Amino acid sequence: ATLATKKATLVAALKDLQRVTVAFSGGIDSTLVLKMALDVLGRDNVTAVVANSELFTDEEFDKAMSLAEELGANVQGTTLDYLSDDHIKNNTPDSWYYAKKMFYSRLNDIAANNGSAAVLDGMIKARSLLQEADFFKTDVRALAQELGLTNWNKVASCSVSSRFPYGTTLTHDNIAQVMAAEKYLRSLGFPTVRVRFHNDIARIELPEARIGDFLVFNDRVNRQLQSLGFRYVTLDLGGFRSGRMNDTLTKAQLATF
Amino acid sequence: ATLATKKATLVAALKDLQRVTVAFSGGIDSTLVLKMALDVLGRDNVTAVVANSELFTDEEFDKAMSLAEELGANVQGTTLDYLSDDHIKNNTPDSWYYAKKMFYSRLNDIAANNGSAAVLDGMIKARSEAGARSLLQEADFFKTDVRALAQELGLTNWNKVASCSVSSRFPYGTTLTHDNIAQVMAAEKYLRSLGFPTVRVRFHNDIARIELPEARIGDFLVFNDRVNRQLQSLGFRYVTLDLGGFR
Amino acid sequence: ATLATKKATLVAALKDLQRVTVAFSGGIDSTLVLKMALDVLGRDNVTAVVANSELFTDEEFDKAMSLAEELGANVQGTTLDYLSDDHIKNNTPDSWYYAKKMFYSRLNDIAANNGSAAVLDGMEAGARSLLQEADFFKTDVRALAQELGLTNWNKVASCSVSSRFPYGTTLTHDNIAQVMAAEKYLRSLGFPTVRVRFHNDIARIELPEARIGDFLVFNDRVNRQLQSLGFRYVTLDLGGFRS
Amino acid sequence: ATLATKKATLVAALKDLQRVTVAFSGGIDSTLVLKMALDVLGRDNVTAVVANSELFTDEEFDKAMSLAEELGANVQGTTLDYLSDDHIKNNTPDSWYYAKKMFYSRLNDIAANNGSAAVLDGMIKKARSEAGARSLLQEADFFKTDVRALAQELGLTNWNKVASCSVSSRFPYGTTLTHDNIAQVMAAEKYLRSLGFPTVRVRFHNDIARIELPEARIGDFLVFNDRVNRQLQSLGFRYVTLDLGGFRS
Amino acid sequence: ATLVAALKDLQRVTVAFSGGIDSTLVLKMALDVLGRDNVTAVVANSELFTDEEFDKAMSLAEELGANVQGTTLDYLSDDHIKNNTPDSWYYAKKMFYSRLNDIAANNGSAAVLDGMIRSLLQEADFFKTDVRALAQELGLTNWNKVASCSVSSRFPYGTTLTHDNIAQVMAAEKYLRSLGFPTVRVRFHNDIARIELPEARIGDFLVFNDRVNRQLQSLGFRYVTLDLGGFR
Amino acid sequence: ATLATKKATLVAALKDLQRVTVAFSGGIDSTLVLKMALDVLGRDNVTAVVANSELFTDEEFDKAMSLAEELGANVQGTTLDYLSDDHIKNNTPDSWYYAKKMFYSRLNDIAANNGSAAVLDGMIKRSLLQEADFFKTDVRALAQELGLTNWNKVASCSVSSRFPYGTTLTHDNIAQVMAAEKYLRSLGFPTVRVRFHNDIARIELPEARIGDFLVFNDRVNRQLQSLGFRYVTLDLGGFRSGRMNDTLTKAQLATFAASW
Ligand SMILES: NC(=O)c1ccc[n+]([C@@H]2O[C@H](COP(=O)(O)O)[C@@H](O)[C@H]2O)c1
Ligand SMILES: NC(=O)c1ccc[n+]([C@@H]2O[C@H](COP(=O)(O)O)[C@@H](O)[C@H]2O)c1
Ligand SMILES: NC(=O)c1ccc[n+]([C@@H]2O[C@H](COP(=O)(O)O)[C@@H](O)[C@H]2O)c1
Ligand SMILES: NC(=O)c1ccc[n+]([C@@H]2O[C@H](COP(=O)(O)O)[C@@H](O)[C@H]2O)c1
Ligand SMILES: NC(=O)c1ccc[n+]([C@@H]2O[C@H](COP(=O)(O)O)[C@@H](O)[C@H]2O)c1
Ligand SMILES: NC(=O)c1ccc[n+]([C@@H]2O[C@H](COP(=O)(O)O)[C@@H](O)[C@H]2O)c1
Ligand SMILES: [Mn+2]
Ligand SMILES: [Mn+2]
């Protein structure tokens, strides 16, 4: 298929849906879906929903709200207490699924009460219209430039649950602890970082190519994260996303581990 | 002349050509030519061609194809066997000219079979042995004129650093083979994967000599052992780092 | 407010001014104002003024003049003799105010003699800072520039060379040239954010702390090059840049 | 307050004891006591005991045995099962005292068997007092400079210059020590020292290894990051980390 | 062994003892050849040398079994030393050796001996390798392994030395050595400290940049810098 | 078993030899033999021979001569022309054996003319240390016992190791390599190799020092270029490659190396 027919199929789904609620993350995919829904259905038939929670930063929430307002959409923030679900609070390995379940359950509630016919999300190759129309990554960038979309959150965040071992209980304080630690490291010029939480040990993951520059901050980072509540502040020798940059022989050894 | 005149004339040349095939590298120049062709003639009358070969990386090829796709052009990959020409195979100083010759000859074949009236490249003020046309250079475009018109048209994305031919990593007179080319390309691909986008693996038979910008060599130390063993599995006996730095 | 609202606030202000003179430094902010002024009012109603002086680099001046032409503006160079004011010449702590005064006084002269309704800056009261009137933040400046296709501007700005001298030290053509050659060489090695602070026979180099690790490979060349410029001791500040 | 008077006191206490067993660590203090006992009492009246256990490396044990042999002493190794005491096994803060108590209790068994009149230690001027072990250097009012002065006088130039600690220092209070995690810690430290880092600790935090190095060596350590990461993981750690505080942070 | 014959001729000696290997051998040979009661070891105390260097030398001379005597010199009372002129070394040498001769005259010593390589050790054609062999030979295991120079080297010529700026320089260098950099100078330029390190250690130093910056500032410096030329 | 037993064995071998010539390099092993020979047999019954040749530095020769004198031995320098043998001259893979052969022939000639019954060398586990079951740890333990404090702390090899097999040795390429190594040691790197690959110099450093080397990159590059090299490079495996790696990547660098 061509981009023109991939765009066809998508206007057809929106025209048929009439009124929609869109899960808006601020990324290129949700930006394109939100912009196409606005273009095809008009401002009065689209409501953009951005989720706020303890497992995502306030900064990403504020940015997502401002991006959706920019597109000229009616935007609604909704607050989720993910920690009320025991799977999330005790970080079971399927915590991801119960968070998504609670997330989509609240969007469906919003959509039922605003008269929207469906919830739309960004997913590419609830209704993922881009993925139904066989949109690839190259197709989303082509139509975004085509429609003049230049602004979107370029950095996709994870759930802070990523920083805790399975079985570790998440609390309001340890979450804030991890997030303050990561925010401080980014302020020193390390935008890609993780502070992994191991109770009284902080284990920092950095891209290995920056480990060398970092040394000048060892003492400042050590004492700052200690005031955040950690007793031991450490640097993971494997780096961020360990094993990914290794030779063929030691990539199959780190992966077997 | 004013920029509008240089642009206006360029639109006139495109209007007269009606249908064009564009040699697309991904740089600022070819991006500007491809965008003007799409604007003046429409998507159905423009074909973007990106060359794939043993002397250039798959990554550079994919980026150029995706950029032409991102501009709304119908883009077409074409593969050239540069090593079938003895001038390129034996890495003579004029190997570049026979490579450009072979590319422009294949561009004319593509244009003949799609009904294009001319081939366009990004050259600014072998290309004429093939009758390919530099429309920017006919319209008296300079580098500042190219950036001025690109900003005017909203072009923010293009390959900012033109990559070189891998023949650059072998001394003149060294015979290029599929194995030594593949060896160098895998080594550079591995080094770039570690976060060193500007890197050179110069080939000295059983010695690999790595050129890095001096300002990044400090950052490299953590990878010494992994780079040493990886390039040895590629076939090198000694893996070395040039103390002089890049170029 | 949305960016569209802030943009409209700015198109309206420019439309009301009709004719403007723009103090153009080449940075992201001055690039956005100059491009918006050209877009709303047209080339014939906008004048780009680039200041040439001894306290800012020739490189900064050359880039700004060619960038203003690349944006399609009529650009005009003006030269300011900052060292003619004794506060600047002897680098008293209020030297900045007299420098800004002399600059804005010359822009107002340029605007009066071409009939511009105001002087606009990138950010005096005789000038209008339209971006801050429309409540533009740094993130907004970036967004609107990407929206309009603006890709070229000086990404690191060098400021006034007077900042490199202690208060009370007299600025001279030779010590200025000494500092400027030293900083020019360091930037040539790949350090665009740098200061060479002048302490007579001591050079005190400020670098962003995250770059000092990478700098070691240049110690000996930097030492010998800055000594040939006239320094006797070439040092690196352990506090880093902005110490 | 004279060195000659302090030595005189030492030969008198040894002469009076007649037969002794000496707890020999290989340090300057135990070397000086062992050398003075040999000179005053003769080789047949002195037995040097070196402790072998899971909490010290085999290299440290072999070194002490050969050092005691080099002084001309009859030396006998004895092995202690420290992990049999619950205080040592579960790493309570008094583990040192129960380890030392068990050590001194075994010394008295050896001394009772060979007819020694006392057990002698290196201490200079806890569970030693309960066991009746004698600090002759401390009774003769030996200070550190007095021990160095007499060692120079006797030609003693060789002794362990760095006394190592119990491996228990690498485990948190409350963590249970096992034969495997001890072996894990010791192999990790042995590998790091082989790379040229003689002062190092691998602190044990279950699935995390936390390496303490002197901060002045951390810069040079970078070249070994990947090799250290994968080697300590093959020893059983899941995460291999470097303490940003450095050694003894 | 030109050495033992030279000592017998002096009969009674006072030894200028610095605590280094050279001075350590002289005191030990003098004590052995002439006896404890006929040798007097003098350790100099002054503002231009570290307390640690002095304390080690006094305690080490006692540990060798010698009668040790401290003597205090006020080098800054000499105008050449106080204003750090280029010949300050020579006027310092005068005060040091003049006070030893007073002590030697007052205890009946026949001469003052120093180390180097009346330096009887240097007269016997001893090299650096010869000093290490003979010290182990006599069981000598202890001595100050790092000899410091006069603190005056850290000040520019013409700068007036004060009790405070000397102490300032001494505390700064004491701090840097504590971090594992035994060869270091902090050169004094009023409000600027200029640190000299061996170039091979500058990489290893980076981890201490911030702590060194804040520590030397509390010592009184406003600017704490690292010399790109390295040490000497 | 014990050190006293192994040492006792040595004095017995020396007493039985009566008169000895000692091949003295200045290292700990030869220093131990030379001092024990002097101690057991006396100065008049031991002869120390130090070899000087074109494949070893003047500094190594001078240190060995000065150290053996410091132990009180009668020392004799002898000069070997290794380059006169074509196997050494053209750096064949067995060049080591013809060099050792020519060396030992001259020691035996010296020993015949001194009335010595054998030549003694420093080999460990007539190599008396190796016969007396001395290991590296026993030689270090016994050396401290006798007060041996001075010896060549970093033993250099023959310069032939710095050339690929088949490369012809000349005074100019030898002087080129040795000058490069002496310059690097002058910067504070006592263990270094400058391997010669025609227009490429490949520097081997202990991996624990390479980060510290960055400050010298430019000076080393330009200095070795004035020595005649066109490219000055650093081996990423370092000196003694593969000996410090982890378990799995040591056995893989083993099959990498044994592939040539
Ligand atoms: N199972 C899923 O579909 C899913 C989705 C999103 C995130 N995650 C989690 O995100 C984590 C990734 O961690 P980092 O991105 O911080 O490195 C993984 O633990 C992964 O389990 C999982
Ligand atoms: N004629 C061309 O189009 C062209 C362009 C860029 C580089 N080159 C070649 O690339 C080489 C430079 O190699 P490096 O950029 O890897 O250093 C030169 O030999 C040069 O001849 C040729
Ligand atoms: N006092 C002011 O309003 C004013 C204005 C502009 C610049 N400055 C000076 O600019 C200098 C900036 O120094 P840097 O060289 O570190 O950027 C400071 O001296 C600062 O005082 C001051
Ligand atoms: N209480 C004691 O007398 C005693 C004795 C031996 C070791 N220790 C322990 O040794 C530890 C120090 O060992 P590290 O070298 O690993 O830091 C301390 O926790 C200290 O409590 C204590
Ligand atoms: N001029 C002399 O004869 C003499 C004698 C002894 C020491 N010194 C001093 O030793 C100093 C050595 O300087 P450093 O601080 O770099 O070690 C010289 O500056 C010099 O002032 C000089
Ligand atoms: N019998 C032997 O194999 C033997 C003996 C002595 C020296 N060598 C040579 O000495 C070299 C040592 O090389 P480097 O010390 O320079 O690294 C060996 O690679 C080897 O070429 C070999
Ligand atoms: Mn870096
Ligand atoms: Mn180092």
Percent in helix of chain A: 40-55%
Distance between the termini of chain A: 43 Å
Shape of chain A: globular
Structural class of chain A: alpha/beta
Helical run tally of chain A: 11
Query: What Rg of chain A do the Cα atoms give?
Result: 21 Å
Active site (chain A): 158
Keywords (chain A): Transferase
Protein name (chain A): ATP-dependent sacrificial sulfur transferase LarE
Organism (chain A): Lactiplantibacillus plantarum (Lactobacillus plantarum)
Summarize the structure.
By secondary structure, chain A is an alpha/beta fold. The first copy, chain A, folds into two domains: 1-158, no CATH class; 159-257, no CATH class. Chain A contains eleven helices and seven strands.
Describe the SSE topology.
The structure is a homohexamer.
Chain A lengths: L2 H15 L2 E4 L4 H14 L4 E7 L5 H13 L3 E6 L6 H4 L5 H20 L3 E3 L8 H4 L4 H10 L25 H16 L6 E5 L2 E5 L2 H7 L3 H10 L4 E5 L11 H9 L1
Parallel strand pairs in A: 1-2, 1-4, 2-3, 6-7
Antiparallel strand pairs in A: 5-6
Helix pairs in contact in A: 1-2, 2-7
The site of one beta-nicotinamide ribose monophosphate has 5 residues of chain B, from loops.
